[PDB]
């Protein structure tokens, strides 16, 4: 969950390599997209869309053993001064597009780093962010220019809890070398389905492993298998994806003067062409070239 | 006034230059694509200008490089313009040069009288690319720094002189201040003199032999 | 219409030039006022304006301070170095890579000495060359696009 | 980010013909 | 849309000025 990111990784969800900390637990990779505008004027509300698509009719393994749908979540890292728009500055069209989304900041004053926790993956395949651009005119460490936008999107359950123990949404290997004896399927009083294992063979060792049911089994009975043989299947149908984008915090005055200069250039070009034409007439008459 | 022109004419010999200039003609087969070399020159002139401009604020030091670039973007009047122009024109120069090469090649203009003009042009291309490689890492950001760090390794492969070449290009056993220093010298001192000499040749030959013939 | 001066084919000095591959500045439209003074500024200002326009609408990014202990994900040079970079990250033999790299300018230096076997300029009149050029061009663009993608899906572009 | 690439490709390819045509036009309207 | 209109319009206007300036200057017998 995006809030587990900020729990384990309080400073930033981005490591110095540009890898988003999310990937430390969401171990498979699916595609994530972003739509930002190429440029925005200062003090303007614009839309950033984060797309987390997955096959809607495929289902995942739930915490117990079930086969449930999946949730979407994303971190959006914006440039300095950028932040989620106040509700009274968002137009209506945009309001309807956003849905029931609880934008939180990653930490105090980290207003440009925006977490978006679990959302039902069937109405939020794409997440709409209403963002308000800052303004160089009345904030002296915000300057016009082009800045990065980092995006981290996930669908589906993770693989590691904050505590460091695996979830039921991954693979399970074999402990040591040797022939497996019994694959018993005992249980406690609280949690439901579990599965035991045993090994041995040759002078030494009688060890055992238990697998939280939910994935699947693909093992027969009794095989001289070494350390780390895939005895599971992979239940994971989700994944995490990163992107980078760029946004230009643009100044209207820059662009105004550009249009003006471009116009001057084109005029000057007409002038020169017409001047050539005058000379072409003079040369035809007075043969002296 | 008292005739200022006749003064200059008498010792500079303007008239001969004028006569020489207006004695040249452009044949019908010369189309718009014969502009590409001249456009390449324009891009470089834009590089010369804006590059010079930036040396008045850029500081080739690991402590100061990155933030001087920041200083240029945020604080210097029109800094952002100067730098963005230098950035884009760097790319346009390389693009136009490729387009120039296309035109030269698909026009047969590199043949018998003109192969030194082609050879000088290839050298110009290697020089230009070197400008690019060197300039790219001057901001000493994550991108530019990690672009040097990969290429600086490449020459090691060469059997006997490889480590020496590598050490020469990076100023020691690894990337650091010496690397930035050398790259800065390369980008702002060596490469502008080298490109000027080879462009000077390239153009002198062109002027000597005129354009190639119709296809 | 236009302005035109026809080749004076009676002047032995022009003839001697043409014979040698070079009398082509002697005839056509006048290089001076016509081209140099009137249209060159057009091309200069036009290219200058495109560049300035791109510079305003899409200014230079500054990255993040270099960090010697953290390698980015995605680590490309500039576009014109993509094809060379591609070659350089996909050949296992490092020496072989350096050589293939070196062979771009050295190969190109040899082009006029190889194609001096004839005096043709027109590409339609030299189908072997036009083919080889097109082949290299296409291989270049191929290796260029190849560099932007994962290695494992590059030597095929992820399409077969 | 490849719909934007192809957008720039298409335009820089296609705008030439618009410029060419518009140049041709001006030549007709002048009486070449 | 606005892009397309503005493009056509900007070029129309300047083709306008090109033509206008051609005949206009011919009229005053400058060209």
């Amino acid at each position: 969950y995006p809030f587990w990111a900020q729990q384990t990784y309080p400073e930033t969800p981005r490591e110095p390599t540009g890898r988003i900390v999310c990937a430390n637990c969401h171990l498979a990779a699916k595609p994530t997209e972003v739509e930002v505008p190429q440029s925005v004027l200062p003090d303007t509300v614009f839309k950033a869309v984060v797309k987390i698509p997955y096959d809607t009719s495929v289902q995942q393994v739930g915490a117990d053993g079930s086969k449930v749908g999946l949730n979407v979540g994303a971190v959006l890292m914006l440039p300095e001064g950028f932040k989620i728009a106040p509700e009274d500055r968002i137009p209506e069209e945009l309001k309807e597009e956003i849905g029931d989304v609880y934008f939180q900041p990653y930490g105090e004053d980290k207003d440009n780093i925006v977490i978006v926790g679990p959302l039902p993956g069937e109405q939020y395949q794409e997440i709409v962010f209403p963002v308000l651009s800052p303004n160089p005119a009345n904030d002296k460490n915000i300057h016009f220019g082009k800045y990065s936008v980092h995006v981290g999107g996930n669908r589906g359950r993770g693989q590691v809890y904050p505590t460091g123990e695996k979830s039921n949404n991954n693979l399970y290997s074999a402990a040591a070398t040797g022939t497996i004896s019994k694959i018993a399927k005992q249980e406690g009083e609280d949690g439901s389905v579990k599965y035991l294992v045993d090994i041995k063979t040759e002078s030494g060792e009688v060890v055992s492993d238990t697998i939280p049911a939910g994935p699947e089994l693909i093992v027969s009975e009794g095989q001289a298998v070494t350390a780390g043989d895939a005895l599971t299947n992979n239940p994971n149908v989700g994944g995490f994806g990163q992107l980078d984008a760029e946004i230009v915090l643009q100044d209207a005055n820059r662009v105004g003067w550009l249009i003006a200069f471009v116009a001057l250039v084109m005029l000057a070009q007409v002038m020169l062409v017409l001047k050539k034409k005058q000379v072409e007439k003079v040369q035809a008459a007075e043969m002296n070239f | 006034m008292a005739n200022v022109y006749d003064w200059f004419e008498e010792r500079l010999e303007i008239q001969a230059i004028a006569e020489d200039v207006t004695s040249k003609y452009v044949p019908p087969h010369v189309n718009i694509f014969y502009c590409l070399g001249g456009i390449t020159l324009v891009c470089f002139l834009i590089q010369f200008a804006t590059g010079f401009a930036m040396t008045f604020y850029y500081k080739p030091t690991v402590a100061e490089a990155y933030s001087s670039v920041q200083y240029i973007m945020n604080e210097v009047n029109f800094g952002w313009l100067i730098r963005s122009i230098h950035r884009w024109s760097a790319s346009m120069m390389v693009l136009m040069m490729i387009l120039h090469v296309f035109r030269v090649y698909l026009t047969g203009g590199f043949k018998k009288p003109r192969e030194l003009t082609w050879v000088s042009g290839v050298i110009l291309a290697v020089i230009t690319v070197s400008f690019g490689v060197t300039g790219y890492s001057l901001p000493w950001d994550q991108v530019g720094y990690w672009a040097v760090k990969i290429v600086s390794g490449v020459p090691e492969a060469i059997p006997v002189v490889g480590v020496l070449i590598s050490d020469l290009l990076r100023g020691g056993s690894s990337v650091g201040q010496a690397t930035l220093t050398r790259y800065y010298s390369a980008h702002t001192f060596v490469l502008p003199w080298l490109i000027a000499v080879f462009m000077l040749f390239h153009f002198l030959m062109i002027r000597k032999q005129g354009i190639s013939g119709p296809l | 219409m236009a302005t035109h001066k026809k080749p004076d084919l009676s002047d032995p000095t022009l003839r001697a030039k043409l014979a040698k591959g070079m009398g082509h500045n002697y005839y056509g439209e006048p290089a001076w006022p016509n081209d140099l003074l009137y249209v060159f500024p057009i091309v200069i200002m036009g290219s200058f304006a495109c560049i300035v326009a791109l510079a305003v609408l899409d200014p230079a990014m500054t990255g993040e301070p270099a960090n010697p202990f953290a390698t980015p994900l995605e680590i490309l040079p500039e576009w014109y170095l993509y094809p060379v970079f591609q070659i350089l990250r996909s050949l296992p033999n490092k020496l072989l890579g350096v050589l293939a790299m070196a062979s771009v300018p050295l190969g190109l230096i040899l082009v006029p000495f190889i194609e001096n076997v004839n005096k043709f300029q027109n590409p339609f009149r030299r189908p072997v060359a036009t083919t080889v050029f097109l082949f290299g061009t296409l291989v270049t663009l191929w290796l260029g696009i190849g560099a932007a993608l994962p290695l494992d899906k590059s030597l095929t572009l992820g399409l077969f | 980010m490849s719909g934007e690439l192809l957008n720039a490709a298409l335009l820089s390819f296609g705008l030439i013909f618009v410029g060419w045509a518009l140049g041709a036009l001006l030549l007709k309207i002048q009486g070449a | 849309m606005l892009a397309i209109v503005a493009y056509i319009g900007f070029l129309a206007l300047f083709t306008g000025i090109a033509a206008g300036l051609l005949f206009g200057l011919r009229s005053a017998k400058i060209l």
Binding site: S39, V40, L41, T44, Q250, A252, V255, G256, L258, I259, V262, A263, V265, M266, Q269, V270, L272, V273, K276 | N31, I32, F33, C35 | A2, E29, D35, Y38, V39, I42, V43, G46, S47, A49, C50, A53, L54, V56, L57 | L11, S12, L15, I16, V18, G19, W20, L22, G23, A24, L26, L27, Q30, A32 | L2, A3, A6, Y7, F10, L11, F14, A18
Partner: peptide, 29 residues
């Protein structure tokens, strides 16, 4: 945000106009 669009438009206009002007001025190509 109209100005942002007119900005890009002007790039595309100079590019086109630059070609036009060359073609016109030097009679073709």
């Amino acid at each position: 945000m109209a100005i942002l669009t007119l900005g890009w438009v002007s790039l595309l206009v100079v590019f086109t106009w630059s070609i036009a002007m060359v073609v016109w001025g030097r009679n073709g190509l």
